[PDB]
Write a protein that binds this ligand. Structure first.
Ligand code: 3PE
Ligand code: 3PE
Ligand code: 3PE
Ligand code: LFA
Ligand code: LFA
Lengths: 100, 55, 504, 470
């Protein structure tokens, strides 16, 4: 009896909140956090879509989504670790040497 | 009056227009990642709004 | 039969010029000389065996020789060559100007002469392929493949006294103009081919098949406009003209690049062969705009040529004015004006070739091109000022030279069509005489206005004097006996004129 | 649908590249040997390229509820495999100077090639997503392979963050699309709509977010700002792979998605992609006017060439040779970009100014000027054949704004391509068989460009043979 539109609205709200956190934060850790929020919101939308149609495809796409989220978080945190190791800061505006 | 070839400058006007447009467009490549994400979200908003208007 | 060999002999000759540089530094000039000797011999053999004087006008198509081979059968694209009187005349002119271009750069003992010679041969082969191709994709292919060696010659082997950046800028501007115009022409060709495909259902690029294509009024105008924009860039037609003085200024000092592909008038041949038969009603509607563009081109080129302090830019603007005359001739729809246009293009090629060669010699002696740093060179040189006087009198339309014959037949046909453009063009001839006298007296008459012009200068070589006097003899014989040239191209002019006036 | 032995023999390049990944990984676990691991990776990629013959004799069929194999899949698999082979060949002399571990590079190249093959064979939203991610993440590793360098680490961070954002955008788009339709297959995206009601807002928004993700992945305006930085900062073999294989695989899956979906012929989607293609051509050509760096210049070149690709994309449902034009253009662009980035890689190898290149490296200068004439669409080059195909397809469907954009961008590209090609011959102030192998690779690339620019008929026949299912 739960409307599909309300679940899609919740997923969209979490998606745009994750995008806002991705944009307005200079710290690379908070942008990685925002990226995790966006991909988890997309997984939530896929779960809701699969649950409305009574299909396991939504949960399978959720499984692929969280596999990508885990591996992307691993790679992004490795890059953040090397950035903090050699730069001693997490300011993403400081790494802007390549321009024009 | 014509020793400076005015028609040559008239047809060279698109060249300086292209140069000015390229120099202006290269300002978007400031190298900042947050601006790149902001431009991606701007493009998402523009594409979605254009799809809703033309539907 | 001989047309593929006519196109391919320059390319094989250029490859041999590049490859035989390891045998010696004085070898590739001989290879290029025998290459254009064989090309000119084949062109004259085609002239003798074609029977062009006895050929009557039978209607488009009518080719004295024809070759066909499938090239891209998916689009119906073929290497399809065809020669007739006008194409044979321009092929002979191409061969003669290539012989002159090889002979003009005989003293270059540079360490990379093979690539210079190869680029010259590739330019000449591209010009021959333009004059021979009757397939639209092949004609466009030659039209754009002949520009890369011109770009590299202007950019790398160009005027050594000037800075490199000026040469790069001039070559890039010339390439951008010619290739953007070619791309517009390709769009027009593609749209015409798609119209024919929607009308009939067959894939073809052959110009004989595209003639009988039903087009609405306005689409035909757009296709004609694309073709005319390409030909107007390459002719040149104002305001699509500044590439010509810019490329002539930064050309190589010998002047062979000018004689190779720049001074050969492929764009007016394209206007006569492709713009008028394929789109006759559109060209009939466009004739006032094109002929007023020709009038503006004549007077603009005259005023630019009078104002130049440089000889090369001056001769380039003379070319602009004479091409304005030819552009006026093309849209008249008159047989007399068309024959005069053919004579005018051949005579203008000869006269401008002589002028550019003599300008190269004069720059070799005096090491400058500014007309304010010279003067009174009649007493300081043996042969050069008199031959330059003869050529400057030739380009002002003097009887006894073929320029007068061509311009006056043009004006006779045009006055049979429209009087006002004719009378304004004759005052343009007055302007042409004005700029020719101005160049002559700023260059060779008066007192020495510098120090290098006040010293005695060595005379011209025997080979260089031989080729200059050969040009002089050819111009005089064209002025007094233009009849074999007229009977050579009488069938093609008749076919084009009858197709233009019988379909409007 | 279950898997048959015929479905296994349709799976041949995927299985071969995966087995190569496992074998190379186990060989790295045995003993770190750069030459033997590189040889194993090249052997596996060449084995998949050979086994494409057996895939072709297997016929065109459906292997999964996800995958579809046809000649289109063979052509894009072959392009991706050739790009990966050239990437390994260019990468070995560059990796000769790398102080750290060099053996993971070929593992990442093999996994990215696996993702490219999956994207070529993709007939599903799941396969599309997994192929995009399987291309992206090894490219995250490869771009930041020289992580000690400032530029490589910066490009890796930018590419990782932006591609994670694009992956989330794309995934939310297919989530909305699946919420509308109920089936993730390509053929059912809008099949439950009729009577002119194809422009459902939720389906259009999901496809718009998918366009956002893919236009990031195809360097399309306005998701193009990453391209010059990521191209410049990454190693030159990585720049080669990112220019050729990733773009070709993603554009192939976009081709298949827009052919098969009923929503692909929507008017609003067509106008949005027309705007994107116009802006992409104009912006990519204009922003490369004043670039003194070859890598950023080639990134903007990639943007322009993908704009011409999208122009060929738009006329898919109207014209008949749109796929043939895309295939011919992509073969030519693969050859040209492989040659140009390979000469850049050979001048950047080993890991430790193009002006005056002819006076010490004449063959590489000739190869570079051949490819910069090719990318400009000059005749006697295959890029001209591709541009001619794009212009013919645009003329057929009356896409006149796109045709004018192609002409103007071609003029601007002519300017900067000729500027570099003539800066090669001005005046300015190895010794192993793998460097010679890279030189042979770029030389055969230049010879192929010249020969198929003079005689384009065999490539046209090959691409016309690669016809997907109707
Ligand atoms: C009859 C009109 C309608 C039909 C037109 C058909 C098109 C062909 C004929 C017109 C061609 C006009 C070309 C004008 C520019 C020529 C090229 C040029 O000038 O290049 C040199 C210039 C660089 O020189 P410089 O200033 O010395 O550089 C140092 C600065 N760092 O280079 C530059 O500044 C950059 C050059 C960029 C590329 C050239 C400009 C392209 C503009 C669009 C081309 C298509 C035409 C569209 C219509 C235009 C308006 C008529
Ligand atoms: C920057 C340089 C390039 C310039 C920009 C790019 C090219 C722009 C071309 C604009 C064309 C506008 C056409 C507007 C009307 C379109 C609808 C129409 O009337 O179509 C008619 C017809 C299709 O109907 P159909 O049943 O085939 O009828 C056959 C008619 N003979 O249609 C057809 O059969 C096909 C019609 C084709 C029309 C010619 C298109 C190309 C013409 C040459 C290039 C443009 C003009 C020259 C350059 C201008 C200045 C730059
Ligand atoms: C980076 C910025 C700077 C560089 C870029 C600058 C801009 C580049 C693009 C410029 C060109 C824009 C498009 C121009 C073509 C427009 C075509 C058009 O509107 O066609 C409409 C119509 C089509 O014909 P239709 O009515 O369909 O016919 C069938 C039924 N009778 O057409 C007709 O009915 C006939 C219309 C004829 C007049 C329109 C064409 C004018 C062409 C102007 C250039 C040539 C002028 C003449 C030659 C000058 C010297 C070369
Ligand atoms: C395409 C190159 C043209 C060069 C100029 C040619 C001008 C025509 C010269 C023809 C020969 C004139 C002198 C000999 C006349 C012989 C007459 C024979 C029949 C009586
Ligand atoms: C910068 C490129 C500008 C290209 C302009 C092309 C204009 C084409 C107009 C077509 C009109 C068709 C009307 C039906």
């Amino acid at each position: 009896m739960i409307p599909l539109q309300h679940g899609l609205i919740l997923a969209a709200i979490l998606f745009v909140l994750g995008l806002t956190g991705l944009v307005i934060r200079r710290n690379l850790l908070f942008m990685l956090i925002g990226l995790e929020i966006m991909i988890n919101a997309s997984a939530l939308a896929f779960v809701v879509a699969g649950s409305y149609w009574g299909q396991t495809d939504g949960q399978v796409m959720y499984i692929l989504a969280i596999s990508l989220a885990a591996a992307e978080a691993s790679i992004g945190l490795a890059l953040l670790l090397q950035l903090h190791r050699r730069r001693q800061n997490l300011n993403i505006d400081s790494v802007s040497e390549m321009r024009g | 009056l014509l020793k400076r070839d005015p028609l040559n400058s008239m047809m060279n006007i698109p060249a300086v227009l292209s140069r000015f447009a390229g120099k202006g467009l290269l300002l978007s490549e400031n190298g900042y990642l947050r601006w790149y994400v902001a431009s991606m979200s701007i493009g998402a908003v523009v594409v979605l709004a254009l799809l809703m208007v033309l539907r | 039969m001989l047309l593929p060999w006519l196109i391919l002999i320059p390319f094989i000759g250029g490859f041999l010029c590049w490859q035989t540089e390891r045998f010696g530094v004085k070898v590739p000039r001989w290879i290029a000389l025998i290459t254009m000797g064989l090309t000119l011999a084949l062109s004259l053999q085609l002239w003798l065996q074609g029977g062009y004087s006895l050929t009557q006008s039978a209607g488009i198509p009518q080719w004295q020789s024809e070759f066909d081979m499938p090239w891209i059968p998916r689009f119906g694209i073929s290497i399809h060559l065809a020669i007739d009187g006008l194409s044979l005349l321009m092929v002979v002119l191409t061969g003669l100007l290539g012989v002159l271009a090889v002979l003009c750069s005989w003293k270059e003992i540079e360490k990379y002469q093979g690539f210079f010679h190869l680029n010259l041969m590739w330019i000449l082969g591209g010009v021959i392929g333009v004059f021979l191709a009757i397939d639209m994709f092949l004609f466009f292919f030659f039209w754009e493949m002949m520009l890369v060696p011109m770009y590299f010659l202007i950019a790398l082997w160009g005027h050594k006294a000037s800075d490199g950046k000026t040469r790069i800028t001039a070559a890039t501007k010339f390439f951008i103009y010619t290739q953007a115009s070619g791309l517009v022409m390709l769009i027009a060709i593609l749209a015409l081919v798609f119209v024919h495909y929607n009308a009939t259902g067959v894939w073809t690029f052959n110009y004989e098949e595209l003639l009988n294509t039903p087009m609405s009024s306005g689409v035909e105008y757009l296709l004609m406009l694309g073709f005319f924009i390409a030909f107007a860039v390459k002719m040149p037609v104002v305001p699509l003209h500044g590439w010509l003085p810019d490329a002539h200024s930064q050309a190589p000092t010998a002047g062979s690049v000018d004689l190779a592909g720049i001074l050969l008038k492929t764009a007016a041949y394209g206007l006569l062969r492709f713009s008028l038969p394929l789109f006759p009603n559109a060209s009939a509607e466009f004739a006032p705009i094109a002929m007023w563009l020709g009038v503006i081109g004549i007077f603009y080129g005259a005023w630019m040529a009078f104002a130049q302090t440089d000889i090369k830019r001056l001769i380039a603007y003379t070319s602009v004015s004479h091409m304005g005359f030819v552009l006026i001739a093309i849209y008249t729809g008159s047989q007399l004006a068309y024959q005069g246009a053919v004579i005018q293009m051949i005579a203008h090629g000869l006269s401008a070739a002589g002028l550019f060669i003599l300008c190269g010699q004069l720059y070799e002696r005096i090491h400058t091109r500014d007309m304010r740093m010279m003067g009174g060179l009649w007493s300081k040189m043996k042969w050069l000022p008199a031959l330059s006087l003869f050529f400057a009198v030739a380009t002002l339309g003097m009887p006894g030279t073929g320029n007068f014959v061509g311009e006056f037949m043009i004006l006779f046909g045009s006055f049979q069509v429209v009087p006002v453009i004719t009378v304004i063009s004759t005052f343009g001839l007055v302007f042409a005489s004005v700029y020719s006298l101005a160049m002559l007296h700023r260059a060779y008459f008066g007192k020495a206005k510098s120090q290098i012009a006040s010293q005695e200068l060595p005379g011209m070589s025997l080979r260089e004097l031989f080729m200059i006097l050969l040009l002089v003899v050819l111009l005089v014989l064209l002025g007094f006996y233009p009849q074999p040239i007229l009977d050579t191209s009488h069938s093609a002019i008749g076919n084009i004129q009858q197709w233009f006036v019988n379909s409007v | 649908m279950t898997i048959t032995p015929q479905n296994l023999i349709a799976l041949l390049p995927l299985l071969i590249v995966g087995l190569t990944v496992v074998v190379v990984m186990l060989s790295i676990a045995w003993r770190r040997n750069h030459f033997l691991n590189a040889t194993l990776s090249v052997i596996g990629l060449n084995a998949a390229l050979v086994s494409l013959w057996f895939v072709g004799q297997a016929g065109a069929m459906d292997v999964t509820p996800l995958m579809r194999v046809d000649g289109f899949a063979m052509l894009y698999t072959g392009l991706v495999l050739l790009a990966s082979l050239a990437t390994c060949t260019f990468a070995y002399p560059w990796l000769e100077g790398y102080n750290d571990n060099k053996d993971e590079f070929y593992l990442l190249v093999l996994i990215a090639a696996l993702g490219g093959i999956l994207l070529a064979n993709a007939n599903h939203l799941a396969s599309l997503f997994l192929g995009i991610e399987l291309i992206s993440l090894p490219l995250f590793g490869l771009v930041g392979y020289a992580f000690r360098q400032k530029r490589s680490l910066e490009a890796s961070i930018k590419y990782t963050i932006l591609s994670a954002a694009a992956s989330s955008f794309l995934l939310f788009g297919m989530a909305l699309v699946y919420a509308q339709s109920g089936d993730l297959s390509f053929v059912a995206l809008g099949k439950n709509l009729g009577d002119g009601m194809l422009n459902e807002p939720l389906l259009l928004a999901g496809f718009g977010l998918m366009i956002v993700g893919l236009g990031f992945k195809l360097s399309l305006v306005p998701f193009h700002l990453w391209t010059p930085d990521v191209y410049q900062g990454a190693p030159a073999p990585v720049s080669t792979f990112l220019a050729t294989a990733s773009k070709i695989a993603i554009f192939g899956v976009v081709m298949r998605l827009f052919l098969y979906a009923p929503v692909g012929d929507s008017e609003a989607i067509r106008v949005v992609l027309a705007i994107i293609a116009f802006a992409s051509i104009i912006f990519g050509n204009l922003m490369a006017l004043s670039q003194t760096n070859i890598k950023r210049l080639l990134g903007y070149s990639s943007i322009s060439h993908l704009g011409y690709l999208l122009v060929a994309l738009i006329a898919l449902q109207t014209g008949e040779m749109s796929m043939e034009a895309v295939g011919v253009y992509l073969a030519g662009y693969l050859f040209s970009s492989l040659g140009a980035f390979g000469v850049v890689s050979l001048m950047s190898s080993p890991y430790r100014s193009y002006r005056g290149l002819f006076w010490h490296r004449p063959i590489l200068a000739a190869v570079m000027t051949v490819m910069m004439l090719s990318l400009a669409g000059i005749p006697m080059t295959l890029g001209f054949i591709g541009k001619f195909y794009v212009l013919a397809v645009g003329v057929q469907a009356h896409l006149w704004w796109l045709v004018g954009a192609v002409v103007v961008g071609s003029a601007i590209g002519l300017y900067y391509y000729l500027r570099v090609a003539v800066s090669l011959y001005l005046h300015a102030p190895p010794s192993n068989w793998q460097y010679s192998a890279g030189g042979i690779v770029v030389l055969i690339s230049a010879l192929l460009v010249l020969v198929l620019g003079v005689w384009p008929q065999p490539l046209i026949s090959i691409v016309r043979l690669a016809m997907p299912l109707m």
